[PDB]
Structures are given as C-alpha cells and as structure tokens.
Design a protein around this ligand. Sequence first.
Ligand SMILES: CC(=O)SCCNC(=O)CCNC(=O)[C@H](O)C(C)(C)COP(=O)(O)OP(=O)(O)OC[C@H]1O[C@@H](n2cnc3c(N)ncnc32)[C@H](O)[C@@H]1OP(=O)(O)O
Ligand SMILES: CC(=O)SCCNC(=O)CCNC(=O)[C@H](O)C(C)(C)COP(=O)(O)OP(=O)(O)OC[C@H]1O[C@@H](n2cnc3c(N)ncnc32)[C@H](O)[C@@H]1OP(=O)(O)O
Lengths: 149, 151, 39, 38
Amino acid sequence: RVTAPEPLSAFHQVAEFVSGEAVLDDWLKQKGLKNQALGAARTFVVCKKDTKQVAGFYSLATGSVNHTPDPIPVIILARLAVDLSFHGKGLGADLLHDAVLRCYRVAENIGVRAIMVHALTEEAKNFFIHHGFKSSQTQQRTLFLRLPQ
Amino acid sequence: GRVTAPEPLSAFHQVAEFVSGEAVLDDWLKQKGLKNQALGAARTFVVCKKDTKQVAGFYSLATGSVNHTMPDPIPVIILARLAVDLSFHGKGLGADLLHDAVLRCYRVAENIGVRAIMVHALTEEAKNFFIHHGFKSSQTQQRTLFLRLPQ
Amino acid sequence: GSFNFNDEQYEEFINLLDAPVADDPVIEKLLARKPQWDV
Amino acid sequence: SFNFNDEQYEEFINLLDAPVADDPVIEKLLARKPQWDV
Ligand SMILES: CC(=O)SCCNC(=O)CCNC(=O)[C@H](O)C(C)(C)COP(=O)(O)OP(=O)(O)OC[C@H]1O[C@@H](n2cnc3c(N)ncnc32)[C@H](O)[C@@H]1OP(=O)(O)O
Ligand SMILES: CC(=O)SCCNC(=O)CCNC(=O)[C@H](O)C(C)(C)COP(=O)(O)OP(=O)(O)OC[C@H]1O[C@@H](n2cnc3c(N)ncnc32)[C@H](O)[C@@H]1OP(=O)(O)O
C-alpha cells in the first residue's frame, strides 16, 4: 500500500511532510537534496503508491570513532521519520528493517563495524532499544548495532 | 534415581555391566576406556548412580585435525562417543551429557583455539539427536556433523 | 584424528566456520520482518 | 567525525570484539540445568 524505498530525488514531494519531530521534517525539506548531491548523507523515501508524496524516510551517513589508534568507520543512521498520517501502522519498523539490511550490504563492501544512532528524545532511544539496538551507558541517547565481520 | 556430576573415567568406575544399545560404544568403554585415558588418546567423562561408581552414561573427547594434502592444517575436537545405559533412557541424561560435553569444548576453545566439535554418527537416529540440539549435518559426508566453537 | 577432506568437504567446513554470524533474537526478528511493499 | 573518551572507546571496542551470539537451539543446550545439580 506504499512504494519500496528509493533514493530522495527533486521529483519527491516533501513540502507537506509532518512526522511530529520538526527538526527531522525541516532537514528533509531544506537539506535532503543538498546532502544527496554532496554525498554527505543518503536519504531513502517511501511514497503513497502511484504518487511521489513521501510517507516516510531515513538517512545513512559515514562516520568514524576516534580516541581523545586509526579511526574506526561506522554508519550513522542520522534520521528516521514516518508522516503522522502513517504513524503506528508498522512503517517505522519496515524502514528500520530496510536501513539495517542496507548497512549490512555496506559493511560487506567497505567494512563499517557498527550502525550508530544519536536519538534526540529519550522516546526515540526506546524505539531503537525495542528493535535490538544497544544503549551506550557512557553517553546519553547514543545507540549501537554491531555489523558482521 | 539421582545421578552424580560428570567425572573423568578412573579404575574405580564399574563399566562391566554397561549396556547402551550400541555394542561398539559399550565394548570400547570396557576394553579401551582406561588405556586411552592413561595414553591421553581420548578423554572419557562418566556419570554414576548416586552413592555408587556404576556408570549410567559417558562421552569421550579427542583432539583431531582437518587437512588437505599446499599447507592447510586445522584442529577440531572429536566427540568420539556418547552413550546412556538403557536403565537411564528417557530421563534426559543424553542431552545432559551433550550439554556438559559442549560446555567443556567451549572452555577448551578458550584455552587452545580448537575451531569446531566434529561428530561421526553410527545410527541415523543418533544423527537426528545431534541435529535436534543444533549440530549441522554435512552434505558431502554421510552421518558427519559439526558445531562451530567461539574464536 | 587427521581426517582428510576433498575440495568440497573442506569448502563446506570453511563455510560453516566463517558462516554468516548469528545475532540477538530481537535483531533476527527485525532482519526477518517482511515490509508492507514486499506483499 | 566522533571523539570518544577512554570509557566511551572501551565500551564500543568491547561491543565490537564481544563474543559472537549462539544459534537459539545451541543457546538452550548451554542454559540447560542438568539432573546432577538437583
Ligand atoms: C533522532 C534520530 O536519530 S531518529 C529518531 C526517531 N524518529 C523520530 O523521533 C521522529 C518522530 N517519530 C517518528 O517518526 C515515529 O513515531 C517513529 C520512528 C518513532 C516510529 O514510527 P511508527 O510508525 O509509530 O512505528 P511502527 O508503527 O512501525 O512501530 C512498530 C513497532 O515499534 C514500536 N514502537 C514505535 N515507536 C516506539 C517507541 N518510541 N518506543 C518503543 N516502541 C516503539 C511499536 O509499538 C511496534 O512494536 P511491536 O511491533 O513490537 O508492537
Ligand atoms: C559414535 C557417535 O557418533 S556417538 C552418537 C551415537 N550414539 C549411539 O548410537 C549410542 C546409543 N544411543 C544412546 O545412547 C541414546 O539413545 C542417545 C545418545 C542416542 C540419546 O540419548 P537419550 O538419553 O536416549 O536421550 P534423552 O532422553 O536425553 O533425549 C533428550 C532429547 O533428545 C531428543 N532425542 C532423543 N533421541 C532422539 C533421536 N533418535 N532423534 C532425534 N531426537 C532425539 C528428545 O526428543 C529430547 O528432546 P527434548 O528434550 O526437546 O524433548
């Protein structure tokens, strides 16, 4: 009843996208395309079928962990949002499913070691904990998922 | 009744009246168990009836290697034998011994780095006992099973 | 000891050792999840 | 991108180098309480 995730393009309608977190909605509308072109971040969207209106999205970005030993590469799941019209319909877990499988394929090809998440609210943190992410006890609202190899 | 914790096969253990249903295992225990224990060829653990030295069940661990004839060595543990006396069938003792055997192979892996438990099943009912407990059936050799060990 | 494996016995064995590593059951549920676009 | 202090870095490295999880069947076998510690 929604389309398979596809890379954000200029043809996707994102103007009327409302998640409940305004910071995520603003990033999508104002920085999605720019970062797509810079390669700073890669945004995938799902649309209402037979339209280009965005029902949900997530952004993957490359990062590294350093000690204050060469840096350890990680994927940053920077953002995940569902439109309020589609909340609690299992789309958020469907996007997390897609996002994590995609990070598995990236790990196989460039050897990123973990998915990192910086949750904005503590309710966002518990969404990831509920789906098997491990909560950092040395940092606030940071979660990890180890990637194969 | 109740059964004792696994201990290494010793001269004090009574094995003469041990019957599993597989004669090859029962004969090995009675005729080769102690000799191999002393030589260190295979290492046998037994459970006894409580307050007794009569063997209710046993297993044997041995060191082996997987080879290609250029240089391709790889050490493994062989679960050579596992048997319960017919008097102790259907008391969950067979799975209790496999529990002990696999934990023991985990501790061995931590100290010498053996990579897998290998099992050579004699009867195909025995094969399905190991499959039921997580062992993987080789498709290139009949009645050969593996369990990967950590590291 | 000293069991000798042919090319596909040795390969099957190596593939079992290096096999796709398992993960926590919650994570396994997430990977197994069939999303609303896969019908 | 990210700078971790010694405790942050350690928690992270211990998560990476952590033992691989076991098959659920095998995990049940390892958790089994045997009839001799009765
Ligand atoms: C900040 C970052 O880096 S990303 C932060 C996450 N995103 C946001 O906070 C943006 C605003 N929020 C959203 O867009 C959404 O509400 C999300 C992403 C939190 C979840 O979207 P939803 O469509 O409500 O989720 P969905 O219906 O797929 O939920 C499926 C499962 O997740 C559970 N779930 C959803 N949200 C939460 C939560 N906050 N805590 C715990 N479980 C949750 C559901 O109960 C359900 O569990 P179940 O299947 O075991 O019963
Ligand atoms: C040389 C080698 O390769 S060693 C392997 C060959 N061993 C032998 O042939 C020895 C002769 N047989 C025996 O000693 C025993 O019958 C054994 C070892 C096969 C089984 O041990 P038992 O004590 O009879 O089994 P136990 O009562 O502990 O059974 C526990 C579990 O095994 C399962 N099981 C028992 N026998 C079988 C079987 N033939 N196939 C599949 N599963 C089996 C049970 O269903 C049970 O599962 P559950 O607890 O989830 O319900």
